[PDB]
Amino acid sequence: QKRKLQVGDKLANRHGNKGVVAKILPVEDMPHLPDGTPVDVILNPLGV
Amino acid sequence: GTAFDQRPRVRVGQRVKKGDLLADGPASEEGFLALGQNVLVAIMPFDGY
Amino acid sequence: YDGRTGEPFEGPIVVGQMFIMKLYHMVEDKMHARSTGPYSLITQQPLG
Amino acid sequence: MAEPGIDKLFGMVDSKYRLTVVVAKRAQQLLRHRFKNTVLEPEERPKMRTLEGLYDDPNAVTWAMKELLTGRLFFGENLVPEDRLQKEMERLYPT
Amino acid sequence: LKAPVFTATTQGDHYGEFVLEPLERGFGVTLGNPLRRILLSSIPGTAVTSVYIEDVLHEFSTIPGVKEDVVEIILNLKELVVRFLDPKMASTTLILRAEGPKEVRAGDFTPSADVEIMNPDLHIATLEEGGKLYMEVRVDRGVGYVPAERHGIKDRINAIPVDAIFSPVRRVAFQVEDTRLGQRTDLDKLTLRIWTDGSVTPLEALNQAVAILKEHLNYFANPEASLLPT
Amino acid sequence: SKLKAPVFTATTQGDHYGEFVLEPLERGFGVTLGNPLRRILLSSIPGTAVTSVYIEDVLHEFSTIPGVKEDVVEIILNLKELVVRFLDPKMASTTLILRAEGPKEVRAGDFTPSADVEIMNPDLHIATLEEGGKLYMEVRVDRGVGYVPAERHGIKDRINAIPVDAIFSPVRRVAFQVEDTRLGQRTDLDKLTLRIWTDGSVTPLEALNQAVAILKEHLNYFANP
Amino acid sequence: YYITQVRKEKKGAGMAFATPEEALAAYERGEVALNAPIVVAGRETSVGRLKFVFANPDEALLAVAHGLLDLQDVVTVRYLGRRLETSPGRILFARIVGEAVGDEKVAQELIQMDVPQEKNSLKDLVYQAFLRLGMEKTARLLDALKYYGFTLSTTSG
């Protein structure tokens, strides 16, 4: 069973910033650098 | 229930380094540990999301 | 730059590459909902 | 978007639970006769949005609360005996 | 207040800038974005939709004399980009036969009357002594990103449907800059960049893109249920 | 591709403010139309506003008008809350005039009788003078697009008049918001609601239409020459 | 918070006034060739209070749309029935609570107008609302605030 990220799944980083994907956005949304490249994941500061 | 699966990291007719990556593991990228992805991030609030 | 509306986010944002893991848990395996059906013959309350 | 008109509804009654009990007891009758029982009729009836036009909201309790909110129904604590209450009930097109 | 000068740096099938030189104050973004939006999302392209491999039954399989496995081969195929040519062309089926010590690489596909592989090179399957292959890879005409779990494929069985990444648009950015066109020290010079997989042109994408905005704009047409409480 | 042409409801009050609700738009398009329209809506609709005032007796906004119960500031602001429609479709400038009684309170519909120019909000509390009160005014009205502060234009009709900030834009507020709506299995389709407040002058709906026309017009510049 | 917090630039000690720093003309023209940036202190005022004088919150918030001020610049404004010194965002928060409760007044009455909102400001807003206008309204207030809170903290980023 191939799986694929899903709202409800949980991503973590090496510094213990666990959390659930709660919304996938289409690239039309998503903050993007000036060059055009979009970001990928939008992580909340209030977490820090 | 994770899916351990090896992938070849070496080409046909090549000299091998003593004891070097012939193949990768399940969470491995060319011999180094690969527990996930590095990916373009932005630390900001969205819209309550 | 806000995707939704080309207008820039007022005041700079720290952006960069962060290694992020997908954990053992997934919504796939969770999430279940019953209306009716299999009642145990022993305890007589719905189970299995 | 809390319950529509509930502040008014809580004030109508002594003990709030009474409110529930009336809403329930009404949404009860209002169901056991196809809504041919409303007090509010004309253009007061609550309604529903669709892939289609405004249809009669099918929520008894929602209707029950709108109903009550118009002073048009009464709370007998002990007025009209339970024996006579199920009597003239099954009359105006019940079955 | 003048009408603006339109410019275009269409060099190849990939990449192309477009400039509107003197735009009224703030109009840079007012245009740039809905365009950018419609671009990255809605301009129709093509994708491999599913595959037949010779003696393969599901994705989680492997093929001998093939360093690759079906999964990884599929992640490859996804990237392949087929330019169509006939506009009647709704859906073809590409056929690749491979053998022996060969690096199979897109361009090793069979050429067809109305099909231009836009990114030959591109890895498909490194083959070692004794490797066959024979693929039947189906390219459909769609829009946006259709996951394989959504569409499914009945080009016989052992078919393995493939995730569809249609958009020809590869990335878009746009530049609201200062102009020299003799009015206010507060005007706009827009320049949308646009990158594409040479199957459709920056210019074409842009044109379709505006077409779409227009169509949509015209939905503000003749309105309905009017009048509000007194 | 899929998804039918959406339905566009409009619900209005009849001078200021109307809601506009075009319904099932594919994911995304909500903003894609919504925002650019707002931009155009707040920025590029043609209107008219007071742009310079002369007050007989006294220069400076920061002066003392005697006999006037208010003062130059509240007047300037009061003036900005005035709307006037230019019936004469060629003219691009007009001057208004005022002559003030003793014990009286001056409305905006106490201006110079002048035909050809139509005061849209005849009430409005402009000023007020005391017993033995004198106020004369020469107020310039101008055709325009956005909100243009005095510190920019610096319109000097006289050598004594003080220049005001221009709000030539009949739209006073644009607020829009896209929520999700459902068609069948699809619960996350865009639904854009557009809320336009205009001073009784140009209607919200007219505002919207104008606004669309500007963007479309502009979009036709993306035609290879 | 961010939307109600009031800027404080420092460039400008010799400035604000009961009686003008020279004249008003050159107090304002003081800003343009450097020297004293907008919301600076002194005694009585700031170039912000004399560069910006608005008739409506409407006129104000529009002035904020075109790149002119910043919700949190201090500016002469006539909200309700007085010339307020406020910042357009303090006007805006006031709108929010107002609009979405019904009475633009009662709101202004409840709101701790002259001070940035925080956990406690806001909790006490909610309670205060509940008490005055019934939960129904206090629900709307809640959601209203939940919404503007979110987006605002984004736009600001």
Side-chain angles (χ1 to χ4, degrees), chain C residues 15-39:
Chain C
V15 145
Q17 271 172 315
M18 178 191 265
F19 165 76
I20 292 200
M21 271 142 21
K22 187 198 184 181
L23 304 203
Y24 175 63
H25 325 79
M26 348 224 221
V27 250
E28 207 82 63
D29 293 287
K30 340 275 207 217
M31 132 80 149
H32 325 265
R34 150 191 199 97
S35 58
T36 22
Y39 308 122

Short mmCIF file of all heavy atoms in Angstrom, two decimals, chain C residues 15-39:
data_model
loop_
_atom_site.label_atom_id
_atom_site.label_comp_id
_atom_site.label_asym_id
_atom_site.label_seq_id
_atom_site.Cartn_x
_atom_site.Cartn_y
_atom_site.Cartn_z
N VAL C 15 12.95 31.81 6.22
CA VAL C 15 12.65 30.74 5.26
C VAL C 15 13.92 29.91 5.08
O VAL C 15 15.02 30.46 5.16
CB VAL C 15 12.26 31.38 3.92
CG1 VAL C 15 12.73 30.55 2.70
CG2 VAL C 15 10.78 31.62 3.89
N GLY C 16 13.77 28.61 4.86
CA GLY C 16 14.92 27.75 4.63
C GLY C 16 14.57 26.29 4.59
O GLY C 16 13.41 25.91 4.69
N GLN C 17 15.59 25.44 4.44
CA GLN C 17 15.38 23.99 4.29
C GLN C 17 15.45 23.28 5.61
O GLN C 17 16.46 23.36 6.31
CB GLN C 17 16.48 23.42 3.45
CG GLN C 17 16.18 23.43 2.02
CD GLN C 17 17.38 23.03 1.26
OE1 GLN C 17 18.49 23.50 1.55
NE2 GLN C 17 17.21 22.12 0.30
N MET C 18 14.39 22.57 5.95
CA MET C 18 14.39 21.88 7.23
C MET C 18 14.06 20.43 7.00
O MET C 18 13.10 20.11 6.33
CB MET C 18 13.42 22.53 8.19
CG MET C 18 13.33 21.85 9.53
SD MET C 18 11.94 22.47 10.46
CE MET C 18 12.73 23.80 11.52
N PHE C 19 14.91 19.55 7.53
CA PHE C 19 14.68 18.12 7.45
C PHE C 19 13.49 17.73 8.34
O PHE C 19 13.43 18.09 9.52
CB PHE C 19 15.95 17.39 7.88
CG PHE C 19 15.74 15.94 8.19
CD1 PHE C 19 15.59 15.02 7.16
CD2 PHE C 19 15.70 15.50 9.50
CE1 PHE C 19 15.39 13.67 7.43
CE2 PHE C 19 15.50 14.16 9.78
CZ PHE C 19 15.35 13.23 8.74
N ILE C 20 12.55 17.02 7.77
CA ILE C 20 11.31 16.74 8.46
C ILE C 20 10.92 15.29 8.18
O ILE C 20 11.06 14.80 7.05
CB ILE C 20 10.19 17.76 8.04
CG1 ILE C 20 10.53 19.19 8.55
CG2 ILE C 20 8.80 17.28 8.49
CD1 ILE C 20 9.36 20.18 8.66
N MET C 21 10.46 14.60 9.22
CA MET C 21 10.22 13.17 9.14
C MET C 21 8.75 12.86 9.09
O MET C 21 7.95 13.64 9.60
CB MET C 21 10.82 12.53 10.37
CG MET C 21 12.24 12.15 10.17
SD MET C 21 13.18 12.44 11.59
CE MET C 21 12.02 12.46 12.78
N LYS C 22 8.39 11.73 8.49
CA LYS C 22 7.01 11.27 8.58
C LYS C 22 6.93 10.16 9.62
O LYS C 22 7.66 9.16 9.55
CB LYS C 22 6.50 10.83 7.20
CG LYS C 22 5.02 10.49 7.12
CD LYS C 22 4.73 9.67 5.88
CE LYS C 22 3.25 9.40 5.70
NZ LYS C 22 3.00 8.58 4.49
N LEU C 23 6.07 10.31 10.61
CA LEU C 23 6.06 9.34 11.70
C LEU C 23 5.14 8.12 11.55
O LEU C 23 4.29 8.04 10.64
CB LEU C 23 5.84 10.05 13.05
CG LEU C 23 6.88 11.15 13.30
CD1 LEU C 23 7.01 11.45 14.77
CD2 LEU C 23 8.24 10.79 12.66
N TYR C 24 5.32 7.18 12.46
CA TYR C 24 4.70 5.86 12.43
C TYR C 24 3.16 5.96 12.27
O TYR C 24 2.54 5.12 11.60
CB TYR C 24 5.19 5.00 13.66
CG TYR C 24 4.52 3.65 13.79
CD1 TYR C 24 4.67 2.67 12.80
CD2 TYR C 24 3.68 3.37 14.88
CE1 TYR C 24 4.01 1.42 12.88
CE2 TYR C 24 3.00 2.13 14.98
CZ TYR C 24 3.18 1.16 13.97
OH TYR C 24 2.54 -0.08 14.04
N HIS C 25 2.57 7.01 12.84
CA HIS C 25 1.12 7.21 12.84
C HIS C 25 0.63 7.80 11.54
O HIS C 25 1.36 8.56 10.87
CB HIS C 25 0.71 8.12 14.00
CG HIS C 25 1.55 7.93 15.22
ND1 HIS C 25 2.82 8.47 15.35
CD2 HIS C 25 1.33 7.21 16.35
CE1 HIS C 25 3.34 8.11 16.51
NE2 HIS C 25 2.46 7.34 17.13
N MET C 26 -0.59 7.41 11.17
CA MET C 26 -1.24 7.95 9.97
C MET C 26 -2.75 7.82 10.15
O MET C 26 -3.21 6.85 10.74
CB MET C 26 -0.77 7.25 8.68
CG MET C 26 0.49 6.33 8.78
SD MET C 26 1.69 6.55 7.41
CE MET C 26 2.20 4.83 6.99
N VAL C 27 -3.51 8.82 9.66
CA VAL C 27 -4.99 8.81 9.66
C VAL C 27 -5.63 7.57 9.03
O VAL C 27 -6.70 7.13 9.45
CB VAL C 27 -5.58 10.00 8.89
CG1 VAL C 27 -6.23 10.99 9.83
CG2 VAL C 27 -4.54 10.65 8.00
N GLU C 28 -4.98 7.06 7.98
CA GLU C 28 -5.35 5.81 7.33
C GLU C 28 -5.69 4.74 8.37
O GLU C 28 -6.80 4.21 8.39
CB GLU C 28 -4.20 5.31 6.45
CG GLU C 28 -4.62 4.45 5.27
CD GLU C 28 -5.08 5.29 4.09
OE1 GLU C 28 -4.26 6.08 3.54
OE2 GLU C 28 -6.27 5.17 3.73
N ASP C 29 -4.73 4.41 9.22
CA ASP C 29 -4.94 3.36 10.18
C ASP C 29 -5.99 3.72 11.27
O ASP C 29 -6.66 2.83 11.79
CB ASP C 29 -3.59 2.92 10.77
CG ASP C 29 -2.68 2.21 9.72
OD1 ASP C 29 -2.95 1.04 9.33
OD2 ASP C 29 -1.64 2.74 9.25
N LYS C 30 -6.14 5.01 11.58
CA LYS C 30 -7.13 5.48 12.57
C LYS C 30 -8.41 5.82 11.82
O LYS C 30 -8.50 5.56 10.62
CB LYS C 30 -6.63 6.72 13.32
CG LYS C 30 -5.13 6.97 13.30
CD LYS C 30 -4.45 6.17 14.41
CE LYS C 30 -3.15 6.83 14.87
NZ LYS C 30 -2.03 5.87 15.22
N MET C 31 -9.41 6.40 12.50
CA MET C 31 -10.63 6.86 11.80
C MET C 31 -11.54 5.69 11.40
O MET C 31 -11.27 4.92 10.49
CB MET C 31 -10.28 7.79 10.61
CG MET C 31 -10.98 7.48 9.28
SD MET C 31 -12.68 8.13 9.26
CE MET C 31 -12.87 8.49 7.51
N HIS C 32 -12.62 5.59 12.15
CA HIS C 32 -13.55 4.48 12.13
C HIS C 32 -14.86 5.11 12.54
O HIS C 32 -14.87 6.05 13.35
CB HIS C 32 -13.15 3.43 13.17
CG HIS C 32 -11.66 3.29 13.35
ND1 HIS C 32 -10.92 2.33 12.68
CD2 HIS C 32 -10.78 3.99 14.09
CE1 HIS C 32 -9.65 2.45 13.01
NE2 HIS C 32 -9.53 3.45 13.86
N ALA C 33 -15.96 4.62 11.99
CA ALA C 33 -17.27 5.14 12.32
C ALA C 33 -18.36 4.08 12.12
O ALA C 33 -18.47 3.50 11.05
CB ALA C 33 -17.57 6.40 11.51
N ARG C 34 -19.15 3.81 13.14
CA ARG C 34 -20.19 2.82 13.03
C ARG C 34 -21.56 3.44 13.19
O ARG C 34 -21.74 4.44 13.91
CB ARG C 34 -19.98 1.73 14.07
CG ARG C 34 -21.24 1.02 14.60
CD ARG C 34 -20.91 0.19 15.79
NE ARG C 34 -21.88 -0.84 16.13
CZ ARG C 34 -21.80 -2.11 15.78
NH1 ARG C 34 -20.81 -2.55 15.01
NH2 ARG C 34 -22.73 -2.96 16.18
N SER C 35 -22.52 2.82 12.53
CA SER C 35 -23.91 3.09 12.82
C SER C 35 -24.52 1.91 13.57
O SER C 35 -25.17 2.10 14.59
CB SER C 35 -24.69 3.37 11.54
OG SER C 35 -24.61 2.29 10.61
N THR C 36 -24.31 0.69 13.08
CA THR C 36 -24.93 -0.48 13.68
C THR C 36 -24.17 -1.71 13.26
O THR C 36 -23.19 -1.64 12.52
CB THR C 36 -26.41 -0.67 13.23
OG1 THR C 36 -26.65 0.00 11.99
CG2 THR C 36 -27.38 -0.03 14.18
N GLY C 37 -24.65 -2.85 13.74
CA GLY C 37 -24.25 -4.12 13.20
C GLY C 37 -23.88 -5.10 14.27
O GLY C 37 -24.65 -5.36 15.20
N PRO C 38 -22.67 -5.64 14.15
CA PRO C 38 -22.30 -6.86 14.85
C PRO C 38 -22.39 -6.67 16.35
O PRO C 38 -21.54 -5.95 16.94
CB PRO C 38 -20.86 -7.08 14.39
CG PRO C 38 -20.80 -6.39 13.10
CD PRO C 38 -21.56 -5.11 13.35
N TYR C 39 -23.41 -7.29 16.94
CA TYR C 39 -23.51 -7.37 18.40
C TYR C 39 -23.02 -8.72 18.93
O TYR C 39 -23.50 -9.77 18.49
CB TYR C 39 -24.94 -7.08 18.87
CG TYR C 39 -25.49 -5.78 18.33
CD1 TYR C 39 -26.66 -5.77 17.58
CD2 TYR C 39 -24.84 -4.57 18.56
CE1 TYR C 39 -27.17 -4.60 17.08
CE2 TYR C 39 -25.33 -3.39 18.06
CZ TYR C 39 -26.50 -3.41 17.32
OH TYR C 39 -27.02 -2.24 16.79
#
